[PDB]
């Protein structure tokens, strides 16, 4: 499960949350894998997809809303986009997800 794969990284490795910080990370090239929620705005979705195309970053669409991405990271609030700066003890990069 993806929830097991993510919650490990959020308790072990370096990460970020939200739009502005992910874009800052893509500019720095320090992002390795970005996670995009389903219910995110189309303009912000296209802007992240294009920025990742520039930085050459692997892109993963999270199946389900931002609430379920907040649940996945284990936080009460909602998150539109999550990045992976540092991959944890899991092999999340080399996997399909």
């Amino acid at each position: 499960s993806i929830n097991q794969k993510l919650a490990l990284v959020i308790k072990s490795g370096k990460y970020t949350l939200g739009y502005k910080s992910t874009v800052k990370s893509l500019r720095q090239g320090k992002s390795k894998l970005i996670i995009i929620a389903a219910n995110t705005p189309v303009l912000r979705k296209s802007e992240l997809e294009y920025y990742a195309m520039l930085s050459k970053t692997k892109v993963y669409y999270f199946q389900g809303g931002n609430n379920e991405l907040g649940t996945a990271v284990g936080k009460l609030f909602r998150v539109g986009v999550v990045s992976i700066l540092e991959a944890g003890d899991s092999d999340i990069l080399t996997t399909l997800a």
């Binding site: 303009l43 296209s46 802007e47 294009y50």
Partner: protein, 112 residues
């Protein structure tokens, strides 16, 4: 404790017929007819009071300079800077989706 009359001919309490009781230099109270208040100009794309534009009567915009009716950007005196930002982003990516669609179209034609 002076009581105050309407000054213009309309005896009614309409939108146009508002009253401010003002103390005059003759030491007496008298009514002043309140000019109908100016509104903020608004974002045509957003629906929000756009910053840096003077708030005047419609006819009153004719007297004032262009630097009180326009901010310096493109779509300056008509949009938000957020709604301008959003359409710069949008027009860029739509224009680039056109390129990608031409790349796919040219590839499929070569396949056939």
């Amino acid at each position: 404790a002076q009581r105050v009359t309407f000054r213009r001919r309309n005896p009614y309490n309409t939108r146009s017929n508002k009253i401010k009781v003002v103390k005059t230099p003759g030491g007496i109270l008298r009514a002043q007819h309140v000019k109908k208040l100016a509104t903020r100009p608004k974002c045509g794309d957003c629906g929000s009071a756009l910053q840096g534009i003077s708030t005047l009567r419609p006819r009153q915009y004719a007297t004032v300079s262009k630097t009180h009716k326009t901010v310096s950007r493109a779509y300056g005196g008509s949009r938000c800077a957020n709604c301008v930002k959003e359409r710069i982003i949008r027009a860029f990516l739509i224009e680039e989706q056109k390129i990608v669609k031409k790349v796919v179209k040219e590839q499929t034609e070569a396949a056939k």
